[PDB]
Inverse folding.
């Protein structure tokens, strides 16, 4: 899987003329070279529904006079650039106008994404209709006729559809359209039927041609949906609707599954379709680095001007990131993540949470923020993952012990694992009893919110002893055999009519309300929804409480310590074949501009970044900066090594060579 | 005016007992010393309406047994700490329950801030009622009986009120309550009558006792409202509702007026009343530094626990900022700002704008962001300011040439000033004709939005030649005697039903649409609302266009150039008495946590920050880091000096000593 990809959008209105008139093999090749691009996904069929080749199963764009798809594959292949081919599935707008009977409908007869033809935008087809047969024919034609390096199928996933075809079919199969569960399950079958028919059609022509089905998100805990692809493309524009948490939450779930996967961002300031929109180079330098460090290849979105001329400014911008990716690839191929901590996301565990961004939940964003800022080495796991390689399992806020979860947690604890649990985590489904041996009994929903946490151990809060406000829902708890690491204090009263103090919550009554943080032999419990609190209010104390509990659980076994500050990111990747570890160190700080877009313009050097590793190896040979190939001083005793990076700009890889 | 103030909130419910029971002279003094506090505003009367002294004109808090106000003034005065005294005016909640007839009403009979007594919160009194007489009595009592260092009067400003008293009075004075203008003007008289009665009552007891009337914002272009105070306190919690633009927009307007003024932030993570809420020290280190650099003293908000014990964690946190302010004060007293650029805010010019934060407009935030990120030395000016000392006047987006503005702009241009204007700036009120000699004629509202700007000069856009998307409303214009610095390109069409291309706007038609940026002898015009665009979308090209035009207008006369990166702030302040300039250099990067709060945890050193100054002095004696008192190498030729700061952490002052 190539590291330096471009996703070249070509959603082009029938009402624009002279399509491709300014295309040239020379221009296409010069700009790929300016961008250091080694793969470019080009269009066979766009959202408007047109083919960019003289098609027999679809209509060519009515203002295109030549085989643009063919010319692009030839131009790229002649300079060693691979060319996966894009087909819009969910959208075919020129067919939408002829076959509205095949479009998705909600319960109230509404189309998506746009609810009429009297407004601009696209109308999604239902794959439970004969539109599926037309899609297979069109996919078959492209796979037969063109020497592409794979197929990208867009606007697909499990839907809920109430179109005439779906309502008749559900009634004939004895399903109830008024039962939401029935319609969700119908849509699971409809989607699986589509991906099964695509794999069979393609395997009858070019066996093992790569296929990716784009839903815009990799749904966690769904191995069936991931397995319908040959590889994963994580569409994740941090300035385009996804936010900056979405990529690490996805990548740290993807890498341990064994799938090859890329992070796809955009060249655009905002989102897809932003003609004339440009990030600063430093944004793409950091975003590509963060893909490499997490075990991913890179894609950068672009849209080709209707005239077919590739934009110089764009490939200048892509090249500033991709020249650096070229020099580092060698240290990223076949890499496996070393992690101390398994995070079972609320999403992976199949439990309801508050949305905090388009495809991320608030508990999950809370936890990932603390893990990244805390330099904890982690993977994200689901109920199918093997937990036994992880020292600590995090159960954030809402992991109730249902039939599908408790046995796997009990087995992890029996085998010597430790758990960090917060809030409802560990409760039975009924929320009446704590089922994990964490050293306390549950006395029910805490009856004050907000309330206070007082640390009872030194080195937890940077400012020391105080009553710190907790905004999360709490559990009142009673110590049994556990050790108290901090306590709950009640406010004088809850903010209410006739009883309120100042602008917000009442101050602390300074009356003890039982323990707030409890340590036992098998881990640490925090009596508040602290992870959702950190994604909502962002109080620093929430992170300090969690990172204190994790550092205590990991003790002397912690694999990494560093002075890399909070906004920085680190990973420790293993190239076994090459008998080396790669410590990835990054520092960039997105900053809010416009109303809410978080952007990167500055890239500030750090100096004298100290790392202490604890590798499961016998003898450390040497330590060097890649790709500079600059030895640095280190001190090693067995697999325990310490070093200092003189200077870090954006991203620095530090290679530790060993003897096993 | 002291540099190290605390605003000690004490809004305390009647339903909390043992008020002040844990107060002690020793605790109050220890915590002031831990915090390096040299002034603390303490409460005589809170929002709940209680006195904190045995009052004859108001009721003491019913659970307070001793003169808390008296004890606090004595404890502070005995260690050389000044004590201004706080009186809630707008709120007296225990009186609200007895005299609801004196409360403000809107057109629909609604109270503010909270629209019933069956919900928690405060109910604002109307100062057009006999409540004003009770306020004067209570202010008189506090000024007679207590040795305070000033009065802070809270919840006041110009209102619009439709209470029974106001409606009767308006009808009797021949005003029309259904005419909004009439009610606004009534409220201007009501507020002026309140501040006039306060100054006369206080001057009859302690002539020239400091008074500040808090509206939460200094309204720009209103010298009458500023002049009702002895000094200005800019309430500006960047994590508490105000945002990070509000302080520089206010401070760079305040300093050149001659008022002594402070920046008031909070110790809290969020806003006032956040018991148990704590920022990281680095946030207050930066925020206090930014006050010093802009010519302001510092206040940090706190709220005293009802028990009267000052919180150790809080005064640890305040001390980490205030120890550093103590060492730097010497270089901030009697300082005057050196600026190349006058920014006439939309607010100062009295013109409508889109709100972009609680008390800042989008055009004004756009402009301040570009000036700070661009290291342009600036003041904010109104129609009463003297413009003649400024090389460049900025007219952002919407400064139409009404009777109150055009003569002052024509006089500034005649005297050799240059203007940067955008969008509607310079148009007549009718928006049919450009009234400034900027080298083009106006051909009306541009009929495409969005559209494109192509730079025609090198060194404008970091990625070079391209069509960059402009989202702001445009003016189509026609070159006459001006020079074109870039052009407008039309899209194929506007996004509409039946005509749309891809997800957003149509790509560039590459058809010239007239000039977009025009240079003349007297300045530069940009044919888009670029400042509102930068506060909405945040496209980097918008800043690059503006800073290119400003650098061109200033040419060789630019007073400062630096490698301090974009997120950094610089000012050049003049201590005339001490025959030195102070170059202030800051780097901190607030980062979004929770849902939207922008916080500071990291403080990253910068290295080898280069500055070139052009001072109007003959001979530079020396250059040193204060307060370290460390000489640095420099090269001077007349008033032209260059130096390099080895290391900058948070804030560094660089002192340039001269001979005139
Ligand atoms: Zn359907
Ligand atoms: Zn009134």
């Amino acid at each position: 899987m190539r590291y330096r990809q471009v996703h070249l959008d070509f959603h082009t209105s029938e009402h624009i003329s002279d399509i491709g008139r300014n295309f040239s093999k020379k221009n296409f090749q010069e700009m790929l070279q300016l961008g250091h691009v080694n793969s470019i996904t080009v269009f066979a069929k766009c959202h408007h529904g047109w083919a960019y080749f003289p098609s027999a199963t679809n209509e060519i764009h009515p203002r295109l006079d030549f085989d643009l798809l063919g010319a692009q594959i030839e131009a790229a292949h002649e300079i060693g650039v691979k060319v996966p081919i894009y087909i819009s599935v969910g959208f075919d707008e020129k067919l939408a106008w002829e076959k509205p009977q095949w479009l998705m409908r909600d319960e109230a007869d509404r189309m998506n994404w746009v609810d009429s033809f009297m407004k601009p935008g696209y109308h999604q087809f239902c794959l439970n209709t004969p539109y599926l047969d037309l899609v297979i024919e069109q996919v078959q034609e492209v796979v037969r006729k063109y020497d592409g390096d794979g197929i990208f199928l867009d606007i697909v996933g499990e839907r809920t559809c109430y179109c005439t075809t779906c309502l008749k079919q559900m009634q004939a199969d004895g399903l109830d359209p008024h039962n939401k569960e029935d319609v969700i399950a119908n849509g699971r079958r409809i989607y699986a039927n589509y991906t099964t028919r695509i794999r069979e059609a393609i395997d009858a022509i070019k066996p093992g041609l790569p296929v990716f089905h784009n839903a815009g998100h990799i749904h966690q805990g769904r191995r069936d949906l991931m397995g319908m692809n040959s590889h994963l493309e994580l569409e994740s524009l941090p300035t385009g609707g996804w936010g900056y948490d979405h990529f690490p939450l996805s990548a740290r779930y993807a890498q341990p599954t064994g799938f090859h996967f890329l992070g796809m961002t955009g060249k655009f300031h905002t989102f897809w379709g932003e003609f004339g929109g440009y990030k600063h180079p430093n944004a793409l330098r950091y975003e590509t680095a963060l893909s490499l460090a997490n075990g991913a290849r890179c894609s950068i979105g672009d849209q080709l001007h209707p005239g077919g001329q590739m934009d110089r400014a764009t490939y200048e911008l892509i090249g500033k990131a991709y020249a650096e990716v070229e020099a580092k690839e060698a240290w990223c191929v076949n890499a496996v993540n070393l992690a101390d901590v398994a995070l079972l996301t609320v999403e992976a565990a199949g439990v309801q949470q508050e949305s905090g961004a388009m495809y991320s939940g608030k508990v999950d964003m809370g936890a990932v923020r603390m893990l990244l800022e805390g330099k904890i080495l982690f993977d994200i796991v689901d109920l199918e993952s093997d937990w036994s390689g992880y020292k600590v399992l995090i159960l954030p806020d809402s992991i109730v012990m249902k039939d599908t979860i408790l046995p796997k947690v009990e087995a992890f604890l029996a085998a010597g694992g430790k758990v960090l649990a917060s809030g409802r985590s560990g409760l039975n489904v009924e929320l009446t009893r704590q089922m994990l041996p964490l050293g306390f009994t549950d006395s029910g929903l805490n009856p004050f919110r907000p309330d206070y946490f007082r640390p009872l151990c030194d080195g937890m809060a940077n400012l020391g002893e105080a009553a710190y406000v907790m905004y999360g829902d709490g559990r009142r708890i009673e110590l049994t055999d556990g050790t108290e690491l901090g306590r709950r204090e009640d406010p004088y009263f809850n903010r209410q009519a006739f009883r309120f103090c100042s602008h917000q919550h009442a101050p602390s009554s300074e009356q003890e309300g039982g323990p707030g943080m409890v340590e036992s032999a098998q881990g640490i419990y925090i009596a508040w929804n602290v992870f959702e609190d950190y994604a909502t209010k962002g109080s620093l104390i929430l992170k300090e409480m969690v990172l204190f509990a994790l550092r205590r659980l990991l003790g002397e076994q912690i694999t990494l310590k560093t002075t890399l500050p909070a906004q920085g990111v680190t990973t420790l990747q293993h190239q076994a074949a090459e008998r080396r570890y790669i410590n990835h160190l990054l520092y960039a700080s997105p900053v809010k501009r416009g109303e809410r877009v978080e952007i990167i313009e500055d890239m500030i050097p750090l100096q004298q970044v100290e790392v202490q590793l604890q590798l499961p190896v016998t003898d450390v040979k040497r330590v060097y900066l890649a790709p500079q190939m600059t030895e640095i001083e280190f001190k090693a005793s067995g697999g325990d090594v310490q070093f200092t990076v003189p200077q870090l700009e954006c991203h620095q890889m530090v290679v530790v060579e060993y003897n096993e």
Remarks:
- Chain B touches chain A through 96 residues (CB under 8 Å).
- The pocket of zinc ion (ligand 2) is lined by residues B 104, 126, 128, 161, 163, 165-166 (CB under 6 Å).
